[PDB]
Amino acid sequence: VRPVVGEIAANSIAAEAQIAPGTELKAVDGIETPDWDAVRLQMVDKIGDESTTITVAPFGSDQRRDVKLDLRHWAFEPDKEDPVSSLGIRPR
Ligand code: NI
């Protein structure tokens, strides 16, 4: 169930934030995200914002990292597109 990254598009907003395949997204701006729909819901709420901070769990790591996404070049159409894709992420 948990939101675990499978691939990361080169040069994407996630690639620049150093998010790596097999990383799990634990929170978006301190709001826990137990699944991908919860990630999607939080990201939609960042429309218009310059940045958001994600807390991630690298693969098989116990360490948790806060990573800042730069959203100043971000656009997606919320009726037609998956926000998770628009960040460079392919779910596992
Ligand atoms: Ni805002």
Curated annotation (Swiss-Prot):
A site-2 regulated intramembrane protease (S2P) that cleaves the peptide bond between 'Ala-108' and 'Cys-109' in the transmembrane region of RseA. Part of a regulated intramembrane proteolysis (RIP) cascade. Acts on DegS-cleaved RseA to release the cytoplasmic domain of RseA, residue 'Val-148' of RseA may be required for this. This provides the cell with sigma-E (RpoE) activity through the proteolysis of RseA. Belongs to the peptidase M50B family. Induction: Part of the sigma-E regulon. Also has a primary sigma-70 factor promoter. Residues 1-92 form the PDZ domain. Interacts with RseA; the third transmembrane domain can be cross-linked to the transmembrane domain of RseA. Regulated intramembrane proteolysis (RIP) occurs when an extracytoplasmic signal triggers a concerted proteolytic cascade to transmit information and elicit cellular responses. A membrane-spanning regulatory substrate protein is first cut extracytoplasmically (site-1 protease, S1P), then within the membrane itself (site-2 protease, S2P, this enzyme), while cytoplasmic proteases finish degrading the regulatory protein, liberating the effector protein. The gene is rseP. It comes from the Bacteria. Coiled coil: none annotated. This is Regulator of sigma-E protease RseP. The 2 circularly premutated PDZ domains act to negatively regulate protease action on intact RseA; mutations in PDZ 1 (PDZ-N) have a more deleterious effect than similar mutations in PDZ 2 (PDZ-C). Changing residue 89 to A: No cleavage of RseA in vitro, cleavage of RseA in vivo. Disruption phenotype: Essential. Depletion experiments lead to cessation of growth, elongated cells and limited lysis, as well as decreased amounts of sigma-E. Not essential in an rseA deletion strain, when sigma-E is overexpressed or in ompA-ompC deletion strain. In the latter has severely decreased growth at 20 degrees Celsius. Accumulation of an RseA proteolysis intermediate. It comes from Escherichia coli (strain K12). It is found in: Cell inner membrane.
